[PDB]
Amino acid sequence: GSRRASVGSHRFKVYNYKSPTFCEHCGTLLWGLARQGLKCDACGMNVHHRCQTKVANLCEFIVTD
Numbered sequence: 001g002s003r004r005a006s007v008g009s010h011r012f013k014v015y016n017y018k019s020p021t022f023c024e025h026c027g028t029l030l031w032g033l034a035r036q037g038l039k040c041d042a043c044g045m046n047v048h049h050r051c052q053t054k055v056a057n058l059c060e061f062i063v064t065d
């Protein structure tokens with residue numbers, strides 16, 4: 001089946017956003033045409049590069065057997 005996992009760290013990777021997107025740590029716009037911020041590979045959370053180390057929430061995602 002599947003489980004709702006909740007883990008201690010995100011897996012952030014630089015991402016190229018295609019529409020105006022806001023930082024899920026600080027709230028403000030991820031500015032630019034490209035490389036505007038980091039998307040978590042596991043849950044999709046978007047943050048600024050400069051906000052990465054400040055992120056304090058759990059990373060939640062569905063795991064399917």
Ligand SMILES: [Zn+2]
Binds near residue numbers: 009041043060
């Ligand atoms: Zn995450």
Ligand SMILES: [Zn+2]
Binds near residue numbers: 050
């Ligand atoms: Zn931010």
